[PDB]
Amino acid sequence: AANNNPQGTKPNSLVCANCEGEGCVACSQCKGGGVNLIDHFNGQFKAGALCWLCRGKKEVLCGDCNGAGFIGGFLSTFDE
Amino acid sequence: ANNNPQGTKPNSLVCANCEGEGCVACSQCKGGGVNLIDHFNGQFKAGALCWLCRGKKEVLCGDCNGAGFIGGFLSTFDE
Amino acid sequence: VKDYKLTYYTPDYTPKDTDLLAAFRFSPQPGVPADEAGAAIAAESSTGTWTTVWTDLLTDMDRYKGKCYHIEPVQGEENSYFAFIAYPLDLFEEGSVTNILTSIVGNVFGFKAIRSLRLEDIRFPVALVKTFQGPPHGIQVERDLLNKYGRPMLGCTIKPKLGLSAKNYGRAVYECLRGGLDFTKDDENINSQPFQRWRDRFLFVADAIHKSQAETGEIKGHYLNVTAPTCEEMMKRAEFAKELGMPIIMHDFLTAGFTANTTLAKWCRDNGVLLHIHRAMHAVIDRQRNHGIHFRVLAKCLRLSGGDHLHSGTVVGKLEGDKASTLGFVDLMREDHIEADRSRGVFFTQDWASMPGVLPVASGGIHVWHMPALVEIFGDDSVLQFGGGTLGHPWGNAPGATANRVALEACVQARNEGRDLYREGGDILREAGKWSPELAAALDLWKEIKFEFETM
Amino acid sequence: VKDYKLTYYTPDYTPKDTDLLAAFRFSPQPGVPADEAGAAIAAESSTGTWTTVWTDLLTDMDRYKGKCYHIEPVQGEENSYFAFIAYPLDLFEEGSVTNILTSIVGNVFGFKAIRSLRLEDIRFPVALVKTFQGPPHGIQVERDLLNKYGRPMLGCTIKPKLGLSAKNYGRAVYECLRGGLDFTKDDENINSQPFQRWRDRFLFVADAIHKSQAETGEIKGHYLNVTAPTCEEMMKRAEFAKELGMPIIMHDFLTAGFTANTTLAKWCRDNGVLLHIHRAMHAVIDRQRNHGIHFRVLAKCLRLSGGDHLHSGTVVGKLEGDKASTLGFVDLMREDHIEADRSRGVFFTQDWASMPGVLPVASGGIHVWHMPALVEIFGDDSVLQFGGGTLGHPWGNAPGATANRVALEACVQARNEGRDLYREGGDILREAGKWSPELAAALDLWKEIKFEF
Numbered sequence A: 001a002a003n004n005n006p007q008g009t010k011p012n013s014l015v016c017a018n019c020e021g022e023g024c025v026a027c028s029q030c031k032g033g034g035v036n037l038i039d040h041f042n043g044q045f046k047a048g049a050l051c052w053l054c055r056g057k058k059e060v061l062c063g064d065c066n067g068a069g070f071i072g073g074f075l076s077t078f079d080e
Numbered sequence B: 001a002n003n004n005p006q007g008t009k010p011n012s013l014v015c016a017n018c019e020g021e022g023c024v025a026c027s028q029c030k031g032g033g034v035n036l037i038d039h040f041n042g043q044f045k046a047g048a049l050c051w052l053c054r055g056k057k058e059v060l061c062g063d064c065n066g067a068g069f070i071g072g073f074l075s076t077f078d079e
Numbered sequence C: 001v002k003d004y005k006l007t008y009y010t011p012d013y014t015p016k017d018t019d020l021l022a023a024f025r026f027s028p029q030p031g032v033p034a035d036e037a038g039a040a041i042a043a044e045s046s047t048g049t050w051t052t053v054w055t056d057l058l059t060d061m062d063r064y065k066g067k068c069y070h071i072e073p074v075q076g077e078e079n080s081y082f083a084f085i086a087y088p089l090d091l092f093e094e095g096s097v098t099n100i101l102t103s104i105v106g107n108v109f110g111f112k113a114i115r116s117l118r119l120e121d122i123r124f125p126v127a128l129v130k131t132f133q134g135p136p137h138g139i140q141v142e143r144d145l146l147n148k149y150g151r152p153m154l155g156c157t158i159k160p161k162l163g164l165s166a167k168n169y170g171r172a173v174y175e176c177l178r179g180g181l182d183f184t185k186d187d188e189n190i191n192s193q194p195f196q197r198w199r200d201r202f203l204f205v206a207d208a209i210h211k212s213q214a215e216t217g218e219i220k221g222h223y224l225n226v227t228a229p230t231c232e233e234m235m236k237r238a239e240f241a242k243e244l245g246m247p248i249i250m251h252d253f254l255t256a257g258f259t260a261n262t263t264l265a266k267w268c269r270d271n272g273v274l275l276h277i278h279r280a281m282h283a284v285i286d287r288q289r290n291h292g293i294h295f296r297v298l299a300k301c302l303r304l305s306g307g308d309h310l311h312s313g314t315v316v317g318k319l320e321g322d323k324a325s326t327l328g329f330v331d332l333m334r335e336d337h338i339e340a341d342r343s344r345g346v347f348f349t350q351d352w353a354s355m356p357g358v359l360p361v362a363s364g365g366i367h368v369w370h371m372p373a374l375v376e377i378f379g380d381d382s383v384l385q386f387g388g389g390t391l392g393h394p395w396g397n398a399p400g401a402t403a404n405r406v407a408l409e410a411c412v413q414a415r416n417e418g419r420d421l422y423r424e425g426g427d428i429l430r431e432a433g434k435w436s437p438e439l440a441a442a443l444d445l446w447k448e449i450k451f452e453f454e455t456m
Numbered sequence D: 001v002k003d004y005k006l007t008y009y010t011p012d013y014t015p016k017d018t019d020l021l022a023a024f025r026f027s028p029q030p031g032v033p034a035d036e037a038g039a040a041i042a043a044e045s046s047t048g049t050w051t052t053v054w055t056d057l058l059t060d061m062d063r064y065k066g067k068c069y070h071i072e073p074v075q076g077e078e079n080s081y082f083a084f085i086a087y088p089l090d091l092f093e094e095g096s097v098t099n100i101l102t103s104i105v106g107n108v109f110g111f112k113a114i115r116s117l118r119l120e121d122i123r124f125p126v127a128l129v130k131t132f133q134g135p136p137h138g139i140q141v142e143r144d145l146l147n148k149y150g151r152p153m154l155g156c157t158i159k160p161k162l163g164l165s166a167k168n169y170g171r172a173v174y175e176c177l178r179g180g181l182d183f184t185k186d187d188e189n190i191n192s193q194p195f196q197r198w199r200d201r202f203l204f205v206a207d208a209i210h211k212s213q214a215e216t217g218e219i220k221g222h223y224l225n226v227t228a229p230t231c232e233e234m235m236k237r238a239e240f241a242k243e244l245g246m247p248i249i250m251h252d253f254l255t256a257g258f259t260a261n262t263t264l265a266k267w268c269r270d271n272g273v274l275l276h277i278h279r280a281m282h283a284v285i286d287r288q289r290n291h292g293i294h295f296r297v298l299a300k301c302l303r304l305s306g307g308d309h310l311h312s313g314t315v316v317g318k319l320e321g322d323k324a325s326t327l328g329f330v331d332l333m334r335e336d337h338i339e340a341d342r343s344r345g346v347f348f349t350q351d352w353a354s355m356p357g358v359l360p361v362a363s364g365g366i367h368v369w370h371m372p373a374l375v376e377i378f379g380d381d382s383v384l385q386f387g388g389g390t391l392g393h394p395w396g397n398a399p400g401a402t403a404n405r406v407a408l409e410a411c412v413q414a415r416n417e418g419r420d421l422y423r424e425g426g427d428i429l430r431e432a433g434k435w436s437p438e439l440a441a442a443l444d445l446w447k448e449i450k451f452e453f
Helices: C035-044 C097-104 C140-146 C166-179 C198-216 C231-243 C259-271 C295-305 C320-331 C368-377 C398-416 C425-432 C437-445 D034-044 D097-104 D140-146 D166-179 D199-216 D231-244 D258-271 D295-305 D324-334 D368-377 D398-416 D425-432 D437-445
Strands: A024-026 A059-061 B023-025 B058-060 C020-028 C068-073 C081-087 C114-123 C153-157 C183-185 C248-251 C274-277 C309-311 C359-362 C383-385 D020-028 D067-070 D081-087 D114-123 D153-157 D183-185 D221-225 D248-252 D274-278 D309-311 D359-362 D383-386
Touching (some): C020 C035, C035 C114, C097 C295, C231 C259, C231 D258, C259 D231, C368 C398, C398 C425, C425 C437, D034 D114, D097 D258, D114 D295, D199 D221, D199 D231, D248 D258, D258 D274, D258 D295, D324 D359, D368 D398, D398 D425
Parallel strands (some): C248 C274, C359 C383, D183 D221, D248 D274, D359 D383
Antiparallel strands (some): B023 B058
16 A cells, blocks of 8 residues: 555554554545546446545545554454 | 571571471470479479470471471561 | 472372362572472462471371472573472362462462462363363354354454444444344443443344344344443343343453352353353463463363353464464363373363363454454354454445455355465455455455465 | 644643542563653553544544553663553443453553553542442441450461361360450361361351350450352351351452452441451462552552451561552551652552541461561551461460460550560560460560561
């Protein structure tokens, strides 16, 4: 995505890198625009309407900082 | 007899005042079992059973109350 | 005691088949030997003496005595030893975990001449296993009650939301259960708190369960948290939850205790509900590798006291130094005969005497790209909880459930056909995420992992 | 809003009077700052997020999250800090201490970016203190029930414990109590083993109590262990011990749990029984100085949940530092208002709102030569448990009881007149052991006189 690291913090602090500590990133199908630009399936989603992924919000959750802002805890890692 | 600390053995856990046996020899009748002099009011007269051990010739150890080792719980939790 | 070998360290002694064995890992203070420390650990957790001047009136002695029979060093660590000691069977009450704990680990962990002490394992004889109840139902009975064969079960905790009304809570539960999940879990902090009392929560959750189960066609549930301040409040919550017709409840066995957990397990056995155990406040006892009580001991004590599901932790991220130990104590609570294997942490050979097994629950920040791994490690006798990997789908609650369901079915169906699950995980998921938009969006949101260049 | 601010470390925030404060001592991994670690401890033990993308869906947040407000470092130690955290009041339910435990010390101890974490103190607001029951009776009511004024109380434990029939148990208890002691204690491993069941032990102990009390004129007692495998068995044992007429029972609050302890405390309040709390299985949680839960937090949680006596351990042989801390939390068990004094371990000012006290108990291998020190440190609001110091006398059990009784009375009478007990305690013991043979034998057996400064 925006960062190709598997799951990583900033150099020292615990703040997440991919989301920059916001918890939400910009859609990668419409590039924040909000409308399709190519048919993405057989005929289910045609270009010129709401983006199929973000449904028109231009923002999605982040993958690693799994909604949180850092890289510990019951949200972004495994229980031992 | 009267030593300063509870006194573990050198580089060990065993009690010293008894060398691990748990009981010591009475320091009043010298293991004899019979009094030597008058003690309180002439009520413990020389010639009868020792007033401390009462003829058993052995009393309990003091630093290690029969435990035999020091760091235990019936001999140590006065720290 | 003397040059005489302490009367407690008897290396030529072999234990009976009705003795409770225990393995401590200890590290002594500077200037103290190892054999004396072993004998002292043996004497502290029993009659607290080496000599014979107290426990000798007429005959009673050496019967209620914890002989120590093996001391060895630990490879790699310096100044650290393993002490195997063995207790008789007449010291322990019949049917009480509290007594076993209070007798073994009562006041030995405060020994002064020991720098640190850990309890690594324990072995209950069959004669003692058969005086306890065990889990209310087990694995086969619980799999038959819910009618879920073949695949592992799915669940979704609602963790990050707090301060929600009771009706919106019921609504989220309904949206998840309708979409294709099996269970749903209350946050363990939720109790009768002023913004959300318990009876309202129970009512609306029961309504959601009935609706979704009637309009879907299979059996669905929700772990209701019945942890309470007293015995009376707890039994009252449990009775009301049974009245509504709920299949499963919840409890945590470390803040509430073992007396309450045993009482609740007997009630659940009488009334036919399943019990899900949540391990909270456990890192306070078993995180540091040099002091405390390792967790496999508590897993055994829970299999004895009662419980059908148990949180065990995932192993997708651990190395082989700890993945091995976790797989070890996961086999310690499903099978019926475990052979000693020190590489997997099992110290003694344990035979469970046809007592049922418990069910491991793998949870905590997992998503779709982990599904190939889990289905390969835990097998299909387990439960999978998806905290954030479900409620965060780009367009709702029910689509996330549908995505996870599709991924699990694809992975299982692929494993049945002989295909590998460490080389072809990504392939399976990508080729399945082509006739379903939900799984495509889910695959696009998270990121692949590629565990270790081909495998593990 | 970005985590260049952390939204949780608000240093100028002043905590309200209805907020629950907690003080952690933590040590972070090599490469993590201190402020980030404080904010992460505040977020782990609450809604586990720094961001508002998840919770604040509908204009509601900031009222269910804790916030760090002070991260001072530790003097002397290297790479260790203190972190103060303040939790709102509407996160916890009333009357439940299991909820407080599972909400503060839940998963925070399993955090990965922390090398070690310990919980040192905690402050309950009065708003929350007032919803718990507290001790069944307290201190004043207990002294009035037992009718013993102006001196500590005396108790003895029975070490021949294992493999001793119920009738010989009763006879030993009778000998001890007849000599002059007040309480006898039942060992903490003895519940219902096959060699000695509980009903036929309660019987003979009650018989001995009735004999010795009708013979001496005082009020005698024996702590009867009611720790059972279930709620029903526990209630059965307690009801039987009440029917016989026993004035005090025993329990273990760390192996049996807090639910069972609260249940038993409510029963004991409704039925007029006193409750003595034994602290088995505590070093497994609070020995190491760098991971666990300090014992004063558990003492506070106990005073809230219920209990009349509490074991606290001797303080005579602790040199300093770790001694002044112990005294510290003794003041957290008897007083009503305790000002902050970090030298004695007390971190926050605690006000108990006229809730009763709890009685300390000292034990662990003390003999007659320790009588002055104890009587000067703990005062007169305490119990003194003797192990071998009573059963080891060369003459028997009743002489040992008489010896300890005489020594205690002498030390108390000497303190009343205005005599220093640290300097001339042994002098008092020797001047008293002249007209009594038992005290002389005792003074001659436990050779260690003292450390007289």
